[PDB]
Amino acid sequence: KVFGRCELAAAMKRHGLDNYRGYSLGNWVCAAKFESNFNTQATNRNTDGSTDYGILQINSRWWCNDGRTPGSRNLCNIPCSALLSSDITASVNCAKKIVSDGNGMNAWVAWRNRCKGTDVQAWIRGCRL
Ligand SMILES: [Cl-]
Ligand SMILES: [Cl-]
Ligand code: NA
Numbered sequence: 127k128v129f130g131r132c133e134l135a136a137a138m139k140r141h142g143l144d145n146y147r148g149y150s151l152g153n154w155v156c157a158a159k160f161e162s163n164f165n166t167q168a169t170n171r172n173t174d175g176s177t178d179y180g181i182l183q184i185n186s187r188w189w190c191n192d193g194r195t196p197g198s199r200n201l202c203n204i205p206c207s208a209l210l211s212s213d214i215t216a217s218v219n220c221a222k223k224i225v226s227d228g229n230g231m232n233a234w235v236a237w238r239n240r241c242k243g244t245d246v247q248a249w250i251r252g253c254r255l
Contacts, residue, residue, distance in 0.1 A: 127212035129164040129181065131155065132253035134214075139255055141218040147225045151255075152246035153237065154221075158182055159249070160236040166217075167210050180209035180217045182234070189220055 144151040161183035162168035170178040176187040190206035202220035
């Protein structure tokens, strides 16, 4: 599923990301924009052999199981496929763990490089929320 911007904002809101770990909703929407272009089915193969899955590009190196990431963990306790779902619940719940892992949203390289410090209000402009 390719979410609209405001559609995604509403869903992330509902599931409790606005202010999660102190990160305003716009942070999360901006991160998803540059991680997945709002596409739940997005995947990305990393140099180390791990893969990123879903609208927040959750990495198989720690967070989900894909059966092809040697030495990896599954701290979110779910098959990486469950992160490609049209429904974002598994991705959000797992994102909550990731952002709690010590470095906040810096865990998403694209957030650090493209969203951090920017006008992330703008990502939820016009959105009936
Ligand atoms: Cl915001
Ligand atoms: Cl933080
Ligand atoms: Na894994």
